[PDB]
Amino acid sequence: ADLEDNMETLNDNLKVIEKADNAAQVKDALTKMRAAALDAQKATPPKLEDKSPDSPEMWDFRHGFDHLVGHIDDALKLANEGKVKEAQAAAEQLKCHCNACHQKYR
Ligand code: HEC
Ligand SMILES: [Ca+2]
Ligand SMILES: [Fe+3]
Known part of the structure; x- marks a missing residue:
């Protein structure tokens, strides 16, 4: 739901992929990383919480998720x-x- 949740979803499923035994387990974790990344893309990081949503840093943030x-x-x-x-x-x-x-x- 929130940016921390999503950040940990990325972190967790990275471990799942490292420890996986076949590609379908990898595909599973990646699909969850995909949904977490788009959720994160919609949030405003606290570091930038004081910036315009049209600011160059806010687009840089969002483009990193792209x-x-x-x-x-x-x-x-x-x-x-x-x-x-x-x-x-x-x-x-x-x-x-x-x-x-x-x-x-961060
Ligand atoms: C910006 C375009 C990001 C990319 C891509 C990734 N992360 Fe990230 N991460 C980002 C921010 C702005 C923050 C701070 C959030 C806050 O509320 O202060 C974080 C934080 C994390 C954390 C731990 C912090 C927490 O709140 O639990 C982790 C474990 C983390 N990020 C993991 C992670 C991984 C594994 C990524 C690549 C798959 C990744 N992040 C990308 C911004 C961005
Ligand atoms: Ca490509
Ligand atoms: Fe690249």
Whole structure:
């Protein structure tokens, strides 16, 4: 529901994907990461809570989720075709995009 909830949904299911035994389990966690990322996209981070919603930082925030969802969708294609290792490495690519948004706005 709130930005913290979604942030932990991303964090949790990253672990699920790391520990998964097949690609369908990976696809499961990713689908939950997809929904958590779009929810997060709608929130206003406390760091930016004093900024215009039309401000360059507010669009940067939202566009980081666009890029994160784009990674998830490309990991899903792999996951849906049974390549568990490829899809798990796909998800590991996400981490640098997590961290990059954190540096600015966490
Ligand atoms: C901005 C475009 C983000 C991206 C992409 C990701 N995260 Fe994030 N995260 C972001 C903010 C602005 C915050 C602070 C929220 C607040 O209420 O102060 C966070 C915080 C987290 C946390 C822990 C903090 C908490 O409230 O529990 C975690 C565990 C976390 N974020 C995880 C995470 C992961 C794994 C991501 C990549 C899949 C990721 N985040 C992306 C902003 C953004
Ligand atoms: Ca793509
Ligand atoms: Fe990228």
